[PDB]
Amino acid sequence: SADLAFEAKSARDYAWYDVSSFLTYRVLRTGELEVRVRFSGFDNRHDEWVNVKTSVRERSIPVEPSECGRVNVGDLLLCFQEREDQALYCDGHVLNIKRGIHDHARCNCVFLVRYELDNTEESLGLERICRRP
């Protein structure tokens, strides 16, 4: 097993971002606990306080063409969601898969996902999905 690395969900976004480090923590009077995180490739202006249970987890992993078969329907995926204004990684679920015929070099499978945020759906290739460990 490799050393655990993490991603965290931004409150000004709802997308998930690789975490560079955890600076400190705090406990609100409600009892709510939060850690302060630094996002990889970002200066300290972008640091956030996030809940550990809902907004921090093990990094999603890009899936190799060779293992597309491990991905299944109903699965949770970190999906690179391309739009005009923003391109970002959001959670989604696999509604359907159309399998394809391909060598390990490249995957031509088609995954239909439902984004958790809005419930909207999009079809994605392997290149835009990551799997949970």
């Binding site: 976004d13 971002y17 999603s60 890009p62 923003q86 391109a87 970002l88 990684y89 835009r128």
Partner: peptide, 8 residues
């Protein structure tokens, strides 16, 4: 590696 995200 992941796709290079671009923020709003």
């Amino acid at each position: 590696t992941k796709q290079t995200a671009r923020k709003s």
